[PDB]
């Protein structure tokens, strides 16, 4: 069976797009997002000439920050950004404009990304006994981005991703990680790159297919609501012999419709991963894309119109510190977790740090403790339930407890 997602209501798709539109005007290095550009170009929607300026800004920032003087003529210090994973997404952005990475600037960017994979391959080891410094998600993304531009990686690079899905790897990969690996493998297979691994790549695609389908929840999502978009992108790209893939994907469409109606998709990166699916496209369409299909011009959404809000109380707790932190914080209803953290700081006795990411603000330090290697600050709500959204998107209710927990992964 094939994974197919019948067309959704035009007004629902156009609402998703309206959430992206404010980002088309946010061109600072901190806010530029190649995933947003890719998702819009793969969608049935467009943002007009704003898209041209957005891609130009991407080219200015990614090339100036990573090459030569290595700072932005306009914006100054790039602060160690973009990352290599972000560079891979920039390469997808180029395919979304029917461009190949090229010239002496592009050739050097390609080798930087290849060095990233080589460095991760060395971190993992011929042994497979080490860990990537970033993640297997980024490792797969880097392989995908190169493959889309017809750039080869060595069998020994691909082996680390193969091993991670084969029967001897340790630990458990999320649906999102498995999906991105599957997308990388699919590009290699379609391109007949790495024929010295022809069969292991074929087997790996099937394995990912099976593991994603086994992760389908009763509500129909693959893993969770925010894993379903990339899971569907992977599943749409190959048939699955002897399985009920078609009904599995229809069950996911139901779950997505419910989640969409419930307001689940407001994060720009998450929207950017979902819009291709709702246009029957995936990142694998960037091998030979049709970049000039008609797309509907988006219009601005109604202006917010802020209203009267009651005060609420949220308990913020950090038990990963000695002495522990626990305080009741009052904020306006509809405030985000980040707003709670700002108030806690303003009251005294609390501090934290964030860094920018394509998903928004990422919490990196709490009360002077910065997360170290393979650690992170996990966000949870009562009872012992990890959030599915970040500090700038989760809006807690009165009486809720938000916990920040130091976790090793």
């Amino acid at each position, epitope marked *: 069976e094939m994974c197919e997602i019948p067309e959704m209501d035009s007004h629902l798709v156009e609402k998703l797009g309206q959430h992206l539109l404010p980002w088309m005007d946010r061109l600072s290095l901190e806010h530029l997002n190649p995933s947003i550009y890719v998702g819009l170009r793969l969608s049935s929607l467009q943002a007009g000439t704003k898209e041209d300026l957005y891609l130009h800004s991407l080219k200015l920032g990614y090339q100036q920050c990573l090459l030569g003087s290595a700072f932005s003529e306009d914006d100054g210090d790039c602060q160690g950004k973009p990352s290599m994973g972000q560079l891979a997404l920039y390469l997808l952005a180029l395919r979304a404009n029917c461009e190949f990475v090229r010239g002496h600037k592009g050739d050097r960017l390609v080798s930087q990304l290849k060095w990233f994979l080589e460095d991760e391959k060395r971190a993992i080891g011929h042994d497979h006994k080490g860990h990537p410094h970033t993640s297997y998600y980024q490792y797969g993304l880097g392989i995908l981005a190169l493959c889309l531009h017809q750039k080869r990686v060595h069998d020994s690079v691909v082996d680390k991703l193969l091993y991670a899905v084969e029967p*001897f790897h340790q630990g458990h990969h999320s649906v999102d990680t498995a999906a991105m690996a599957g997308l990388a493998f699919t590009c290699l297979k379609r391109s007949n790159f790495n024929p010295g691994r022809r069969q292991r790549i074929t087997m790996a695609i099937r394995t990912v297919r099976e593991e994603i389908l086994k992760a389908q929840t009763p509500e129909g999502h693959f893993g969770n609501v925010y894993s379903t978009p990339l899971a569907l992108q992977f599943l749409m790209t190959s048939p699955m012999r002897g399985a009920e893939l078609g009904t599995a994907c229809l069950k996911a469409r139901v779950a997505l419709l419910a989640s969409l109606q419930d307001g689940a998709f407001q994060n720009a990166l998450m929207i950017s991963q979902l819009l291709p699916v709702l246009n029957h496209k995936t990142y694998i369409d960037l091998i030979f894309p049709d970049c000039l299909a008609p797309r509907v011009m988006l219009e601005p959404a109604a202006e917010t119109i802020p209203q009267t809000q009651e005060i609420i109380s949220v308990t913020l707790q950090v038990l990963s510190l000695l002495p522990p932190y626990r305080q009741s914080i009052s904020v306006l209803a509809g405030s985000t977790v980040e707003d709670v953290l700002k108030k806690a700081h303003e009251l005294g006795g609390f501090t934290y740090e964030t860094q920018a990411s394509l998903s928004g603000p990422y919490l990196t330090s709490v009360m002077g403790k910065a997360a170290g290697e393979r650690e992170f600050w996990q966000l949870l709500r009562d009872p012992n339930t990890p959030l599915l959204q970040g500090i700038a998107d989760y809006r807690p209710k009165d009486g809720e407890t938000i916990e920040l927990r130091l976790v090793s992964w």
Partner: nanobody
Amino acid sequence: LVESGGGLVQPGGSLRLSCAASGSTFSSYAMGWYRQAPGKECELVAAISRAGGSTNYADSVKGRFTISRDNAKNTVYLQMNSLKPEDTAVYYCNAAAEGETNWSLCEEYDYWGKGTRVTVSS
């Protein structure tokens, strides 16, 4: 840790090899027992379908070795009966490729585990 069960035996003796896989996808793979004899190249000895329904043996070994698996424990077994000197080798567990007449992935791997040494000598 992965491969175990090897040793030194008389001709006609028996051994049971175990291969414990740490990974969640074990059930998604055909598995094979491979061997590298002193001075020789990689050879698939026996392979088994994902479920256990179909098997595949090198001619040298049919009637004497039996491959089995336990997906509940993530383990592949090789029962080696009536051992011959020519069976002397290091034995390795790895994936295999189900086929209609299973098949070796000897040429698609460049990393093998430690394996387990088998020696049959008068």
